[PDB]
Design a protein around this ligand. Structure first.
Ligand SMILES: *[C@@H]1O[C@H](CO)[C@@H](O)[C@H](O)[C@H]1NC(C)=O
Ligand SMILES: [Ca+2]
Lengths: 92, 486
């Protein structure tokens, strides 16, 4: 059931950084472990990753700088609800 | 001498914001400007993408001044805290914004204060995660106000504009018309909650600590509503989001925007409301609002769902399609709460479900349904219990084509009555019919429209606009159920 989303306004997309959103009741410890699992699974495939931030308090998840190549792998992680490619917002 | 915008939001009778804190997620700000000096705390939270000082803090400084400025602010009071999620060019990221929203929530948990208003004077395209974060923060009891967007487009295509729990604000000018911004302008449509002054808005200029600049945009509009919310919440701190939203709608100037400015299909979806502060003149009153669903899309069995807030009652349910290819609507229970569900017809492009959601404490409301009679007097159902009032009639059908407290439908249609025991409530029914693209009937002043329907020649749909029931067709008769506190 884990899905991927990116900005429909193609110019506003910021490929290479992804917000990994985990299911609602996921605990911070589980989010951190999921991030580590991703980095390990990535490293085994020859990919560098960087966990920029671990979300807790509103949504559980993490922000990760990685190749989009890893998205199929990432979508199979435990607890994943969806993954969204980062994108741009602008002063109105 | 009063800036036009501050006069515009001043009510017809009058005599702030200090118990409330307004968070700003924006560019950096000039916090020593005299409009805001000592009232804005810079958190020094910063999460901004690389570019690609007077200029850097122009947007944020102006908006802090619109919200809380000593001389030109709305909530001249109020305390603000600023987070930097926009770079010098006014560009941010969804992730930085999420991290910012999260920071606000963590700050609150560590050091709880009173009501919080969060102003998000920014937009990107539709974002599931940003909308979800907003919803979660709204559900956590924080009030969020965002800019509709400056793209002269449907705000539902943008975030946070499109998040239903966020108060989304479009921009109107001194003539109460939607603001043009170059070749674009204020967004519109059903994700916009209301409009507010957003052209030629004077406020703090980060050029110098006593300078002022006029700016235009839906951010400026949103700042007015953040200010109004802060004032309203200082006065009535216990307001739920739904109570605050109903007040913002109720105290707005109504039917002052020329809707010709909007694309034709967005006119009906776009609220014709310009924000204002509550009058000093204000016991209990019946507040209702019209909630349009997302369009169901064209699937044959497509349904659109319009829901109310947890603390609201669904008093009626209508539907609308521009084609008129429609299987009507029904009020159905769902997670122990009634929702308005509309059904598309075979070959229909889709339909909207249109709920009337009202703040009615001590109400016990139910739905009484009857299936197609298939004969003679039409399909009928009534609120049979002693003392229950009918607040709304709905009807749906499954076919491809065709007296107090009673609803009447087509003989081949099911009929649904919303029946409430609301002993403080008086309701009357006002009808009007004519030979015709649109027929219209309004409740009397001081009465609140709870239900709007067409007597069962090919109607596209019916919908409440404020306290006016509109029936759309391609003698047709509009029927309004109007109620008030007794
Ligand atoms: C609504 O029902 C509840 C629970 O039975 C009851 O306490 C209350 O008297 C009812 N209110 C009205 C106005 O019927
Ligand atoms: Ca909204």
């Amino acid at each position: 059931t884990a899905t991927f989303h990116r900005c429909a306004k193609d110019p506003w997309r910021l490929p290479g950084t992804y917000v990994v959103v985990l299911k609602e009741e996921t605990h911070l410890s589980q989010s951190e472990r999921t991030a580590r699992r991703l980095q390990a699974q990535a490293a085994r495939r020859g990919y560098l990753t960087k966990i920029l931030h671990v979300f807790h308090g509103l949504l559980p998840g993490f922000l990760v700088k990685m190749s989009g190549d890893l998205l199929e792998l990432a979508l199979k992680l435990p607890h994943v609800d969806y993954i969204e490619e980062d994108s741009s917002v602008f002063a109105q | 001498s009063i800036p036009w915008n501050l006069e515009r939001i001043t009510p017809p009778r009058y005599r702030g914001g200090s118990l409330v804190e307004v968070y700003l997620l924006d560019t950096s700000i000039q916090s020593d400007h005299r409009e805001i000096e000592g009232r804005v705390m810079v958190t020094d939270f910063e999460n901004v993408p690389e570019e690609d000082a007077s200029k850097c803090d122009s947007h944020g400084t102006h908006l802090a001044g619109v919200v809380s400025g000593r001389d030109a602010g709305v909530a001249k009071g109020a305390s603000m805290r600023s987070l930097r999620v926009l770079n010098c060019q006014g560009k941010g990221t969804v992730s930085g914004t999420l991290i910012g929203l999260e920071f606000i929530r963590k700050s609150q948990l560590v050091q709880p204060v009173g009501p919080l208003v969060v102003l998000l004077p920014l937009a990107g395209g539709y974002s599931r995660v940003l909308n979800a974060a907003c919803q979660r923060l709204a559900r956590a009891g924080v009030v969020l106000v965002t800019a509709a967007g400056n793209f002269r487009d449907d705000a539902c295509l943008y975030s946070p504009a499109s998040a239903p729990e966020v108060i989304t604000v479009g921009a109107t000018n001194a003539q109460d018309q939607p603001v043009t911004l170059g070749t674009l302008g204020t967004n519109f449509g059903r994700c916009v909650d209301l409009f507010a002054p957003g052209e030629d808005i004077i406020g703090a200029s980060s050029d110098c600590s006593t300078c002022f600049v006029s700016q235009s945009g839906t951010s400026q509009a949103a700042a007015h509503v953040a200010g109004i919310a802060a004032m309203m919440l200082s006065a009535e701190p216990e307001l739920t989001l739904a109570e605050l939203r109903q007040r913002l709608i109720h105290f707005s100037a109504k039917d002052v925007i020329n809707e010709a400015w909007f694309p034709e299909d967005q006119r009906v979806l776009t609220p014709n409301l310009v924000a204002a502060l509550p009058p000093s003149t204000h016991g209990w009153q019946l507040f209702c609002r019209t909630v349009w669903s997302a369009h169901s899309g064209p699937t044959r069995m497509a349904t659109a769902i319009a829901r109310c807030a947890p603390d609201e009652e669904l008093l009626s349910c209508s539907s609308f399609s521009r084609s008129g290819k429609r299987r009507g609507e029904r009020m159905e229970a769902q997670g122990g709460k009634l929702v308005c569900r509309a059904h598309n017809a075979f070959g229909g492009e889709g339909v909207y479900a249109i709920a009337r959601c009202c703040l009615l404490p001590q109400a016990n409301c139910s739905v009484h349904t009857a299936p197609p009679a298939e004969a003679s007097m039409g399909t009928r159902v009534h609120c049979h219990q002693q003392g229950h009032v009918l607040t709304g009639c709905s009807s749906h059908w499954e076919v491809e084509d065709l007296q107090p407290n009673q609803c009447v439908g087509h003989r081949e249609a099911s009929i649904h009555a919303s029946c409430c025991h609301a002993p403080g409530l008086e309701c009357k029914v006002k009808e009007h019919g004519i030979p015709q693209e649109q027929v219209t009937v309004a409740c009397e002043e001081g009465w609140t429209l709870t239900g709007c329907s067409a007597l069962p020649s090919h109607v596209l749909g019916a919908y409440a606009v404020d306290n006016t029931c509109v029936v759309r067709s391609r003698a047709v008769t509009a029927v309004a159920i109007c109620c008030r506190s007794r």
